[PDB]
Amino acid sequence: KLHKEPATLIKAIDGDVVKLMYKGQPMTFRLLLVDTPETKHPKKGVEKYGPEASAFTKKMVENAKKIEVEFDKGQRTDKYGRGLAYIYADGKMVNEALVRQGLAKVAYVYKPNNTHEQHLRKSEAQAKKEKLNIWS
């Protein structure tokens, strides 16, 4: 099964990207299975709720006692060289917290990197029902 490993925050970059020190190496991580509105959108720039999603991720990781990363069962890096992972701040998955708050959508899913897909989809359905942020 999947396992958590320790990492150290270097810098939060956007809602869905964080730079971490991982096994003694600075690395950029892209959060698995979620799309947040972005502040650094290639074509668009700052989308609606982009600053909000980005402040949420930042606070969560900056204020944590512990950060852990959890790789899935498939490829662990994307074509930009970013680590592909679930990120935990004090035992709470950042990927799910964004989706539960209506600050991210569940992304298009690529097996076999889909271990937490069902759980995220449940939180997404709940944030839509509660009409939170993006779903308002």
Side-chain angles (χ1 to χ4, degrees), residues 99-100 102 122-132 135-136:
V99 175
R100 181 61 183 95
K122 283 156 181 213
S123 303
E124 186 187 63
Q126 191 65 41
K128 321 185 250 87
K129 211 237 19 187
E130 302 182 1
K131 280 162 241 104
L132 288 181
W135 306 112
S136 71

Side-chain angles (χ1 to χ4, degrees), residues 8-63:
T8 301
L9 179 68
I10 295 165
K11 184 196 216 285
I13 294 162
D14 224 356
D16 62 348
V17 171
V18 306
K19 282 181 144 203
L20 304 178
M21 198 71 60
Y22 170 66
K23 292 201 290 198
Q25 234 51 262
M27 199 167 125
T28 301
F29 279 81
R30 168 77 169 74
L31 290 190
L32 258 172
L33 287 191
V34 304
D35 279 359
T36 56
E38 304 171 53
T39 59
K40 293 148 65 119
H41 191 280
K43 357 173 326 228
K44 228 24 78 241
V46 197
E47 331 177 83
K48 188 138 205 38
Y49 293 107
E52 285 70 35
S54 170
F56 183 97
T57 295
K58 175 177 225 265
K59 282 344 134 347
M60 191 160 179
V61 295
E62 276 177 348
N63 295 308

Side-chain angles (χ1 to χ4, degrees), residues 82-101:
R82 300 162 330 168
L84 286 173
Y86 310 101
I87 300 297
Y88 296 81
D90 296 322
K92 298 111 170 105
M93 198 200 301
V94 185
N95 318 42
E96 192 265 342
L98 285 157
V99 175
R100 181 61 183 95
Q101 281 304 298

Side-chain angles (χ1 to χ4, degrees), residues 2 15-18 28-36 69-78 82-88 93-99 104-117 119-121:
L2 312 187
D16 62 348
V17 171
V18 306
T28 301
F29 279 81
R30 168 77 169 74
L31 290 190
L32 258 172
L33 287 191
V34 304
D35 279 359
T36 56
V69 300
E70 183 182 63
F71 290 100
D72 211 323
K73 307 158 288 207
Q75 314 96 98
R76 321 240 203 275
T77 68
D78 65 14
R82 300 162 330 168
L84 286 173
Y86 310 101
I87 300 297
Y88 296 81
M93 198 200 301
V94 185
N95 318 42
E96 192 265 342
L98 285 157
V99 175
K105 270 180 195 80
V106 178
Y108 181 61
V109 182
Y110 299 107
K111 279 218 225 38
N113 280 346
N114 68 337
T115 294
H116 294 309
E117 179 194 8
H119 182 211
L120 287 183
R121 275 189 200 287

